[PDB]
Write a protein that binds this ligand. Structure first.
Ligand SMILES: O=C(C1CC1)N1CCN(c2ccc(F)cc2)CC1
Lengths: 412, 412
């Protein structure tokens, strides 16, 4: 029957830090990671800022030889994965390598690489496409390259569920362990969509904040003056482990993963329904999966993208699931600081949820100057709130109406 | 414990036909769907042929306007999915819509859309990128659009495991049902990479047959004159269903999905190990999952890509797993006829494995004129072989060393 799953290692690249502790320091200090993009010329674009990873050194993780072959989103995914495995203390051996797998995902994948190689094709012909173009760009090659470098022979796969990827990746990797298919999974997501195609494509949809003259104030979930999401880069990885396996090796356990919910809105390609009906179905699935009274939830790390329709749908969902308890829990969007890491969003935010439990603090929703109509919950405006947190929920809701909810709680 | 999963509906686009029975008739006649690619200047390319879908009419499924928003790989996945749901006779209601989900995947996704939107960006700058570029290209939009069209509120996700995608999609959807997270799933995959970037990208790796003079002889799994795989387009979808749910509504049951195995080679980015140790672990994992002795396997739909090293690894893996039975079972690669549909390969090949069971015939490996060193198994060279088939395996072994095996059995 179903086994318990705990978090024993975590790894991150975000716009706030080159690891977890430096990123977390930023979150708790209400620091923005959003800045004008320096890696290309955006003067012809309607949005010229985002959350970049600053000063990423791939040579802390990989030979410049292996690294040259890999898109930035794969490099980010590997960096976070390597951090997570080291942080876990896990040693890979002949006795366990079949029982350790990986599920690292991306929503968009290797958009920089495909753009560059598409440009080569068009200006110079097919003989200029890099030999490494396919293995170096396709989304499953975080899982692939990690398994080759560490000798992981367990379940090996990748999700792509747009803005829900990281949450689904962690949730389904827990099911792998819960059901006996593996004892350990490295799970999360990675994204680097800041190329002409990414900024251009989201721009053409008018989905992005155009607050070019105050980029740090752009991402303002539930604020009446929000005008779309901020595009952000990075990676989150967690080592998920069966409880007895963790106990048997004296693993440090951060928290327990008790609940996972999925649902489909079956509403619209890009817009959530105004009432958040699918988000509510998804949270209720996760809470039943965790065997919880909804009143046990202390903290929600919202999806909280800073889109008009997205932010208000989450309020409706939370009110619908939690009723009067909606006024007692704390809910925050760390996207206020990090921006929207798309497929990596659920991965970094699962990590913020686990540290929320470790340190007993709800991170702030920065830039929440004027909450909108009906956004009257404890949204942890401006400043981090120390408080009791036994159960934390992490929500993701993406294109295609695809919802994920993770439930973590303190481990004793 | 666990619930039983049956196949009640199937749908397909392949280089052999615009549905299952037309595709299946080509398979059993040993017809090739491989030809020079039309409406495209491939002069500068080392490979100029593949498996195109011929005469596809999206307006049987979608309005011209809704089709304009979607890459061909999404149109193909939606076509196969609609076929599969129609073939199952399932009726979606408020009483069951939360129990019906989708997992349709792709390995490579929207190369065509990326090409067209690159052209706009490079020629006319970012403002000429299509507003539907992102939602009309992301891999999870087959799952997304299908769920919106049919009102499906069950688990909604998409895998991307390169050439293993359709195998993993079907297996993990089967688990959703086995473990009570859903009663019904539409699962499989779709691909349209037989375009400039696909022929160019795989071409730059020299992974493709260059037999331009005789495209129909290019795909020759286990033949001593093979020189790599053939790029093909299409899609497969299956309606997976809990047994009692299928029995209660009087569903037609094609066969039972009894086993699913996964493994990672942890060996190389593109090359399998010489002895196919990973493929061996995976097939063993799948037989254990089904509670079956290797002696009970009658038919294997091989990965059989027509790569030198891939084909020989699968022979070694099958000898290793089946020992004294390796010669009594029949194994064929339908890629000899369809080419390699990448993430859709596992989807169409599972349908062919289900139809092998229904029709008690092993499909041929065409073009197997001169078996190579050690390729002395019953590879069903040239012509279909009627025979007793109670148990059928379908193997997929993809880039990153990601392995999947499905086990189907006759149901009565
Ligand atoms: O990039 C690849 C690999 C072939 C290189 N694929 C996965 C991500 N796909 C994608 C494009 C736009 C977009 F908005 C989201 C996803 C494109 C196909």
């Amino acid at each position: 029957s179903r086994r318990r799953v705990v978090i024993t290692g975590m790894g991150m690249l975000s716009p706030l830090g080159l690891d977890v502790p430096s990123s977390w320091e930023g979150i708790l200090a209400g620091r923005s990671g959003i800045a004008p993009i320096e890696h290309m010329d955006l003067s012809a674009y309607s949005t010229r800022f985002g959350g970049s990873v600053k000063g990423f050194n791939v040579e802390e993780y990989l030979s410049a030889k292996e690294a040259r072959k890999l898109d930035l989103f794969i490099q980010y995914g590997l960096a976070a994965s390597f951090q997570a495995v080291r942080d876990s203390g896990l040693e890979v051996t002949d006795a366990n390598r079949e029982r350790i797998g990986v599920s690292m995902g991306s929503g968009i994948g290797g958009l920089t690489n495909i753009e560059n190689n598409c440009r080569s094709l068009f200006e110079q012909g097919p003989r200029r496409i890099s030999p490494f173009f396919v293995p170096g760009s396709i989304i499953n090659m975080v899982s692939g390259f990690l398994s080759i470098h560490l000798g992981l022979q367990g379940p090996n796969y990748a999700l792509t569920t747009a803005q829900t990827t990281g949450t689904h990746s962690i949730g389904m990797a827990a099911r792998n362990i819960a059901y006996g298919e593996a004892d350990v999974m490295v799970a999360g997501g990675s994204e680097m969509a800041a190329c002409g195609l990414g900024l251009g494509g989201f721009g053409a949809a008018r989905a992005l904040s155009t607050r070019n003259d105050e980029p740090t104030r752009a991402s303002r979930p539930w604020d009446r003056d929000r005008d779309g999401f901020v595009l952000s880069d990075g990676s989150g990885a967690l080592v998920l482990e069966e409880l007895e396996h963790a106990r048997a090796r004296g693993a440090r356990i951060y928290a327990e993963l008790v609940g996972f919910g999925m649902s489909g809105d079956a509403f619209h390609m890009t817009a959530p329904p105004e009432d958040g009906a699918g988000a509510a179905r998804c949270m209720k699935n996760a809470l039943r999966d965790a065997g919880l009274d909804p009143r046990q939830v202390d903290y929600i790390n919202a999806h909280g993208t800073s889109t008009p329709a997205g932010d208000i749908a989450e309020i409706a969902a939370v009110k619908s699931v939690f009723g009067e308890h909606a006024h007692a829990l704390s809910m925050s969007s760390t996207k206020s600081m990090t921006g929207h890491l798309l497929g990596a969003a659920g991965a970094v935010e699962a990590i913020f949820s686990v540290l929320a439990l470790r340190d007993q603090v709800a991170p702030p929703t920065i830039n929440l100057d004027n909450p909108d109509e009906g956004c009257d919950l404890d949204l942890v405006a401006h400043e981090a709130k120390p408080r009791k947190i036994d159960v934390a929920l992490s929500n993701s809701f993406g294109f295609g109406g695809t919802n994920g909810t993770l439930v973590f709680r303190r481990f004793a």
